[PDB]
Design a protein around this ligand. Structure first.
Ligand SMILES: Nc1ncnc2c1ncn2[C@@H]1O[C@H](COP(=O)(O)OP(=O)(O)O)[C@@H](O)[C@H]1O
Ligand SMILES: Nc1ncnc2c1ncn2[C@@H]1O[C@H](COP(=O)(O)OP(=O)(O)O)[C@@H](O)[C@H]1O
Ligand SMILES: [Mg+2]
Ligand SMILES: [Mg+2]
Lengths: 69, 375, 69, 375
């Protein structure tokens, strides 16, 4: 009975080790994806800020032109 | 831990307490505003005899502790919970006594006088504090925004405040509070999910679905069109994985949950939607500054963390107001903590160090006179 | 001897289970962060397209107001 | 048997199915909602090969047939039992086909969409029915009561619905369902009788003790005082004679069984008692009509057949609400069948004959569109 229990425990150990390795792999993948997404969102924040500044300048000049008209 | 004699900024916002020292850019101790009381009586020996859990200690155990909200719509229901949450924040997280530094607390606009007198009395008589100060949230949020003009929309958990400030000028007559916020949205989502088929009637599940909403629920850009296109769903419906493992499937309900804000008729109240109430408030202001209020509107509150609020506000205001002027809506990043951030930058000024209220003058004057001095 | 071996194997099993739970928690955190960042990227891409359309509208309006001036 | 082309009113209430033709004052076919399935396999020859008993045929034999409840808390568990109970009611008692007259069914408030679509599909596709209609129980009960104002408390077998209707006006936002009813009371009585000494763990005995409760169990006018005076029992304890002959002796347990309704903590649920939930519902309504809801509260459901509920409700509401106004509680005689009675008087109107849903429009529209048309 003890030998059977030891065999079962060793099987469970192997399965847990495989699960841990798979979890670590998925962890690396998810961290990579999150880092890429953070870089993309930061770049898009700078781009949207620049376009917002451009739009503010455009609307200020439009108001000035309307007043002149 | 702290080597600077500066006030402790403790934002006791409805739903989330955010406490931290002045000068910091974000609260270190962030925990929900909940109190867990032991429901049953155990014959067990050795466990903590503590009869009142709080914060993360209560969040970790929501099946055994009956959950009570220490704040409802704005009015403080139980003061024992108040004493519990401050005593906990003082002698369990910050590891500092209030007898060495001031304390700049932030309260909601248009609150009862009983609430203010009660908190001030607990902060002066019971606890030995050198000086107290009550501050409105809207001003500090406008500070953190880095402007002096605009209408702040603060949507907490059980109350929503619209506060117009033009050129750094408060308007106490136009501030209108309406008790529509995250709790009524959680209730609407709960009843519609009960309509879907998954029925629950306990508070722990209510907090779980609240978190699910915070994570997934968003605002729709066109309600009826999304309803039509979701009738035949494909990518419009999403399958969420509960932290317990039960597979939940939620489709259109998401972008119909916050819609109750725009249509209070869903909860059978004659009150107007947040956008229409803000628009009416703008008419109540003067015409001269209305354009500036259109161009400098600011948002605050955790409820504003949903994606799609800015666009919905822009379309609704454009449909209500003329489409000749320019109506830009600005939402600063991390707006939720911005209020607290303001507190920090407000506690470092020497002049503000001169506008505190010491114990002795309060004791002779009494709490009511203190109310007159502040405003 | 086999009882000692089973004890060692069970201790290793507990260690692997703890490591697997920790890895699963990290995986949850990382996947949540990645999904939030991806949703933010998509929403901000929509936003910047809307702002670019507004900028084009403003530029054309300016050109018309200029001609009228 | 029937010479009038009128809808068959079949109230499929949880615990008791009540079927009868429209125009009658009481259901002719009244049988419990249970399905008996052959547990073992017999080598015997000649007995009925029928693999699914129902109604009185199952009640007559509960020792051989494993009993399954076709409805739980409100959500339909098994649809085969549904088809069995309707097919039985159609081709074993009423002796009439559904292809000649309509059918006005009554469903519980706030039920799943799957349940409604399923029953409608079984009533249209499988069975050839000229027209169907789903109706909420509370409206028909208020009809039978002969009023238009009040809050209907319908306590069935596994669910309890509080539905406020003022001036005939439904309030779909305030209807709150709670799964506390006769089954949880039967379970509480069973566990406390197991605590007394007579232990059983089979469903037939559960139904027997359910009947014993229906016959004897009543509500207490003062729980703690009755506990004290029953400590030394004389006339407070009664000796019941089981239909089998075993002499059972039951004392205080009777008036402590329904008390679980007033103290859900006995079953370890954070939900509030029926009276406190009704009171909270009244606060959720508007103040203007609250007095009318106090003066016109109506009750429904078989569970209300216990003696002493009206007085207990009056004392509890008086203790909770002020004692300045007048709070009269009205319980119409034979309230349990009143719902069904309403159905009868609702199926005789010509206008109601114009509000039915025929097969063709449902087939083109589909079940979901039918859900939109009703509400
Ligand atoms: N990260 C988040 N995402 C979505 N909603 C949130 C988030 N944090 C808080 N909320 C919502 O905001 C409400 C609490 O806001 P509160 O903390 O009072 O804001 P503030 O502190 O700015 O006053 C709750 O109803 C909650 O649902
Ligand atoms: N004559 C009676 N006396 C006591 N309780 C009853 C009686 N008839 C039914 N009940 C209880 O009512 C419940 C079933 O009610 P139900 O038939 O659903 O009411 P309704 O038909 O009005 O919805 C069961 O739990 C049962 O114990
Ligand atoms: Mg807020
Ligand atoms: Mg009933």
């Amino acid at each position: 009975s003890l030998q059977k229990k030891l065999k079962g425990t060793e099987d469970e150990l192997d399965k847990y080790s495989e699960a841990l390795k798979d979890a670590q792999e998925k962890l690396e993948l998810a961290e990579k994806k999150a880092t890429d997404a953070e870089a993309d969102v930061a770049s898009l924040n700078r781009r949207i800020q620049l376009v917002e500044e451009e739009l503010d300048r455009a609307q200020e000049r439009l108001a000035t032109a309307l007043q002149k008209l | 831990d702290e080597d600077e004699t500066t006030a402790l900024v403790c934002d006791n916002g409805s739903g989330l307490v955010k406490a931290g020292f002045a000068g910091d850019d974000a609260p270190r101790a962030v925990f929900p505003s909940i109190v867990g009381r032991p429901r049953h009586q155990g014959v067990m020996v050795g466990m903590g005899q503590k009869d009142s859990y709080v914060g993360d200690e209560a969040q970790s155990k929501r099946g055994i502790l009956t959950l009570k909200y220490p704040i409802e719509h704005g009015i403080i229901t139980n003061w024992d919970d108040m004493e519990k949450i401050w005593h906990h924040t003082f002698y369990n997280e910050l590891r500092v006594a209030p007898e060495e530094h001031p304390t700049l607390l932030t309260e909601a606009p248009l609150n009862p006088k009983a609430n203010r007198e009660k908190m001030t009395q607990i902060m002066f008589e019971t606890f030995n504090v050198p000086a107290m100060y009550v501050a409105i949230q809207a001003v500090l949020s406008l500070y953190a925004s880095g402007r002096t003009t605009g209408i702040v929309l603060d949507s907490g958990d059980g109350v929503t405040h619209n506060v117009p400030i033009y050129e750094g000028y408060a308007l106490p007559h136009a501030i209108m509070r309406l008790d529509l916020a995250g709790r009524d949205l959680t209730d609407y989502l709960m009843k519609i999910l009960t309509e879907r088929g998954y029925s629950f009637v306990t508070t722990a599940e209510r907090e779980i679905v609240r978190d699910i909403k915070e994570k997934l629920c968003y605002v729709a850009l066109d309600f009826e069109n999304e309803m039509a296109t979701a009738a035949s769903s494909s990518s419009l419906e999403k399958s969420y994985e509960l932290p317990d493992g039960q597979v939940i499937t939620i489709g259109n309900e998401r972008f119909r949950c916050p819609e109750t804000l725009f249509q209070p008729s869903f909860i059978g109240m004659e009150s107007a939607g947040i956008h229409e109430t803000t628009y009416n408030s703008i008419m109540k202001c003067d015409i001269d500054i209305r354009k500036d209020l259109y161009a400098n509107n600011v948002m605050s509150g955790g409820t504003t963390m949903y994606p799609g609020i800015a666009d919905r506000m822009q379309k609704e205001i454009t449909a209500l107001a003329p489409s000749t002027m320019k109506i830009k809506i600005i939402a600063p990043p991390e707006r939720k903590y911005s209020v607290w951030i303001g507190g920090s930058i407000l506690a470092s000024l020497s002049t503000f160090q001169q506008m505190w209220i010491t114990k002795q003058e309060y004791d002779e004057a009494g709490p009511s006179i203190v109310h007159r001095k502040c405003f």
